């Protein structure tokens, strides 16, 4: 599902990275963010019964939400995520066993990298769309610096994205941004409004 997923990220521009302390909290956050215009929703596997959160958000899937799994650190989590109907898989690092498994299952996997050597290793396993993490450390300047040497790599940072810098991130050449607490933290009313505000900022640039 790679070129479908790439165009989805390119079109929608923002992934909501959901951390939550419960299934109910995750689900209402996912909902609030989607209601605010965010169609790409990354359910982090630090969430209890993350696999069950995903399954149960199929009602939102029917609305056109693209729901995947984040912070996947094992093929076990990945199998569960995929079985639950994750449409994409994100990890903080590069896991070659998860790479293989997703190739096998035809599932779009976005591994994390932080260095050029890490990036090259990711590319050699077939990955050109990479999670930049943590984006607080490897910021817009990292994205820009990789453009020359690695012109076919496209980053989606998590960490270090807010309203005030999101445009700088796109100027640097990101495909999309992953956003956590700046978006998903607070009450569904507030999450919905932050989502709205994010979608508008990005449309603006």
Automatic annotation (TrEMBL):
CDD domains given in the database record: KDPG_aldolase (cd00452)
InterPro entries in the cross-refs: Aldlse_KDPG_KHG, Aldolase_TIM
Pfam families associated with the record: Aldolase (PF01081)
Molecular function terms, GO-annotated: 2-dehydro-3-deoxy-6-phosphogalactonate aldolase activity
UniProt keywords, alphabetically: Carbohydrate metabolism, Lyase
Biological process per Gene Ontology, one example term: D-galactonate catabolic process
Superkingdom assignment: Bacteria
SUPFAM superfamilies hit by this protein: Aldolase
Binding site residues for pyruvate: 19, 71, 131
Cystine bridges: 167-205
Pathway(s) where this gene product acts: Carbohydrate acid metabolism
Entry's family note: Belongs to the KHG/KDPG aldolase family.
UniProt subunit comment: Homotrimer.
Protein's UniProt name: 2-dehydro-3-deoxyphosphogluconate aldolase/4-hydroxy-2-oxoglutarate aldolase
Source organism of the structure: Thermotoga maritima (strain ATCC 43589 / DSM 3109 / JCM 10099 / NBRC 100826 / MSB8)
């Amino acid at each position: 599902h790679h070129m479908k997923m790439e165009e989805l990220f390119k079109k929608h521009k923002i992934v909501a990275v959901l951390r939550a302390n419960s299934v109910e909290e995750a689900k209402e956050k996912a909902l609030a963010v989607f209601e605010g215009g965010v169609h790409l929703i990354e359910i982090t596997f630090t969430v209890p019964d993350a696999d069950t959160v995903i399954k149960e958000l199929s009602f939102l899937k029917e609305k056109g939400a693209i729901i995947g799994a984040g912070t996947v650190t094992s093929v076990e989590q990945c199998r569960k995520a995929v079985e639950s109907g994750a449409e994409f898989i994100v990890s903080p690092h590069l896991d070659e066993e998860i790479s293989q498994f997703c190739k096998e299952k035809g599932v779009f996997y976005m591994p994390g990298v932080m260095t050029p050597t890490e990036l090259v290793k990711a590319m050699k396993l077939g990955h050109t769309i990479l999670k930049l993490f943590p984006g607080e450390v490897v910021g817009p300047q990292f994205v820009k610096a990789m453009k020359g040497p690695f012109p076919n790599v496209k980053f989606v940072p998590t960490g270090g994205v807010n309203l005030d810098n999101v445009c700088e991130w796109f100027k640097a050449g990101v495909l999309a941004v992953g956003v956590g607490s700046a978006l998903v933290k607070g009450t569904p009313d507030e999450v919905r409004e932050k989502a709205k505000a994010f979608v508008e900022k990005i449309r603006g640039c």
